[PDB]
């Protein structure tokens, strides 16, 4: 898991957790908590979906104030 | 880093894990030297025989011998290594119990 | 990357300079005083291949203290394959 500037990459740490937890893991479903955390580091989708709602609720108040 | 640790390993008693070259080649049994010798022959004989047509019998024999040397030597090496390491029959443990 | 902006503006300012060098002669001086040469495709493909292999040389050149004696030998195997290709091209006679 090397990176653009190396430094161990960024999500190798999450992959390390997903892989350590994928040793004799009962099922991927059981360890999916680390895989989703690993995917979240890779694409930042979880932050984005929250950012969209934080933007939307703030936008919804601003849009409601603007429409009056 | 590297490590010679193998999958499906040590099915037979290991003699020297990760044998150094110049030892695994100094372990050639009179069968390995007989495998490295028959491969070089079937490779020189085919190499000379293939070249009867284009007039290149000598040099095609030489290049068939080069192919045979490389191949039969890597085969004798495979054998003597899987023997020194725990992969093959490995009846040459007397060489370790004696030396 | 930060140092790429000076050459980014260099392209445009040199465009301006060359446009002025173009317009200078244009203003003054008023009214009164072989079917195919395939070797150019062989030379071209061969430059393509050798510049690909120089592209592979560059990281191995700048990072050779890191890869102590193993990156060197891996690059020398890549280079022996380059040399086999180049000897097949020399003997076959594409370098003419």
């Amino acid at each position: 898991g090397w990176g653009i500037t190396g430094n161990k990459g960024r999500c190798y740490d999450f992959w390390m957790d997903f892989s350590e937890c994928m040793s004799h893991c009962r099922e991927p479903k059981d360890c999916t908590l680390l895989r989703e955390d690993y995917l979240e580091c890779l694409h930042h989708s979880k932050e984005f979906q929250r950012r969209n709602r934080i933007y939307k609720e703030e936008q919804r108040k601003l849009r409601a104030a603007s429409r009056k | 880093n590297t490590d010679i640790t193998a999958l499906e390993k040590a099915q037979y008693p290991v003699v020297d894990r990760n044998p150094a070259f110049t030892k695994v080649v100094g372990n050639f049994s009179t069968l390995d030297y007989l495998r490295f010798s028959t491969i070089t022959g079937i490779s020189v004989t085919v190499g000379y025989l293939s070249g009867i047509k284009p007039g290149i019998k000598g040099p095609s024999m030489v290049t068939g011998g080069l192919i045979g040397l490389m191949g039969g030597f890597m085969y004798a090496y495979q054998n003597s290594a899987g023997r020194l390491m725990g992969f093959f029959p490995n009846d040459g443990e007397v060489a370790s119990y004696q030396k | 990357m930060l140092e790429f902006a000076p050459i980014f503006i260099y392209l445009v300012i040199s465009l301006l300079v060359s446009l002025i060098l173009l317009g200078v002669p244009f203003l003054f001086a008023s009214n009164s005083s072989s079917r195919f040469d395939i070797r150019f495709y062989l030379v071209s493909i061969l430059f393509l291949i050798f510049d690909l292999e120089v592209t592979f040389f560059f990281p191995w050149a700048v990072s050779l203290n890191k890869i102590d004696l193993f990156g060197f030998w891996s690059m020398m195997a890549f280079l022996f394959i380059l040399t086999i290709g180049f000897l097949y091209e020399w003997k076959r006679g594409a370098l003419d």
């Binding site: 090397w2 990176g3 960024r10 | - | 393509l48 592979f56």
Partner: protein, 85 residues
């Protein structure tokens, strides 16, 4: 912003496959679109390597560079041979 640098590469790839589908008549545009889609997947590897902060992307992008280049070499050489003498 990763989406902007990926969906743009994705639709460059779509342009490549589109030109493949349309231009079954002319082959030079076929090869143009081949190298186009082998860029839109190459630039895709580079973008996804910067995003994920992972170096496997750039290693694979370099190897695709020096493989699509040999592919273009053999492609155009086959195209020149196809227009025999």
């Amino acid at each position: 912003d990763l989406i902007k640098y990926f969906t743009f590469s994705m639709i460059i790839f779509i342009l490549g496959i589109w030109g493949i589908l349309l231009n079954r008549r002319n082959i030079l545009i076929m090869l143009m679109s081949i190298e186009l889609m082998l860029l839109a997947v190459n630039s895709n590897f580079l973008v996804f390597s910067v995003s994920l902060d992972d170096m496997m992307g750039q290693v694979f992008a370099l190897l695709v560079l020096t493989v699509a280049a040999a592919e273009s070499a053999i492609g155009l050489a086959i195209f020149v041979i196809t227009f025999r003498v």
